[PDB]
């Protein structure tokens, strides 16, 4: 299948409570593999998946040095953002950044990403050309001008097309037994009366990996989009995910409802119904 690598940085100021906290996590697809937290007793980039543990001390030392340098950069960026938005030094603010690379099923680069936010709103994004910028506001246009003058896009492009792809491919090979294994959902429908004339049908998907899934209810073969309660996909804690979709249906009409499940681990989409007794 297709695969991605993504890093997520969060920098959170806290005036009066020390320097801003910096947390970074790295993922391959829906598998976290590294973390870094500037509030740890001894901040270090640390493994979070079995297949990264084999990397040697040069890897861990180099990733730690880079994350410490990044924490310093993002502390500076929080100070700069206060200037750009005319904000006081008393408030708590957050910079977030996500970046990485996507590969298609053939292992080829599909696209790169590198986007940042300030206080949970888009700030600046590298465009898909890996060459030009989209700034969300007049503050981010200042950053854009600085980055254009310094040819930052070219440096990010070189990472995203080069080391990002090369290291993702390495991880996919070293973690192949898990990263390249889809676990299909285990599915079933439950039934719970709500009253004498309506009942909830809940279609469950459990134990699946990766997280992407489609669960839909049809009534007489028509999708019930506007009448379905669909919970957010949620982690089980064993690498797998869970989801459910529910509809409230007239009693006696349960057999007119079908649940449809699509997942990369399934050879063909599944159709399920409530099976009494």
């Amino acid at each position: 299948g297709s695969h991605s690598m993504r890093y997520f940085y969060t920098a959170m100021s806290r005036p009066g409570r020390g320097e801003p906290r910096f947390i970074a996590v790295g993922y391959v697809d829906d598998t976290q593999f590294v973390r870094f937290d500037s509030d740890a007793a001894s901040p270090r980039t640390e493994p979070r998946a079995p297949w990264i543990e084999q990397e040697g001390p040069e890897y861990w030392d180099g990733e730690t040095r880079n994350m410490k340098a990044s924490a310093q950069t993002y502390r500076e960026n929080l100070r700069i953002a206060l200037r750009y938005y005319n904000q006081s030094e008393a408030g708590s603010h957050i910079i977030q950044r996500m970046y990485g690379c996507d590969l298609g099923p053939d292992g080829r680069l599909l696209r790169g990403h590198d986007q940042s936010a300030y206080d949970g709103k888009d700030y600046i994004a590298l465009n898909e050309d890996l060459s030009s910028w989209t700034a969300a506001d007049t503050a981010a246009q200042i950053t854009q001008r600085k980055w254009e003058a310094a040819r930052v896009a070219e440096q990010l492009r070189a990472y995203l097309e080069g080391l990002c792809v090369e290291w993702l491919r390495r991880y996919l090979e070293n973690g192949k037994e898990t990263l390249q294994r889809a676990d299909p959902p285990k599915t079933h429908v439950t039934h719970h009366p709500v009253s004498d004339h309506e009942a909830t049908l809940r279609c469950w998907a459990l134990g699946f990996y990766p997280a992407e899934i489609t669960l839909t209810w049809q009534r007489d073969g028509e999708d019930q989009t506007q009448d379905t309660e669909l919970v957010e996909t949620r982690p089980a804690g064993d690498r797998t995910f869970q989801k459910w979709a529910a509809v409230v249906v007239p009693s006696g009409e349960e057999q007119r409802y079908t649940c449809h499940v699509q997942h990369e681990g399934l050879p063909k989409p599944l159709t399920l119904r409530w099976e009494p007794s």
């Binding site: 790295g26 340098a69 990044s70 500076e76 953002a81 750009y84 600085k146 990472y159 990002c164 290291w167």
Partner: peptide
């Protein structure tokens, strides 16, 4: 492996 490009705002 993380990117190392320094991106000061």
């Amino acid at each position: 492996k993380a990117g190392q490009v320094v991106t000061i705002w």
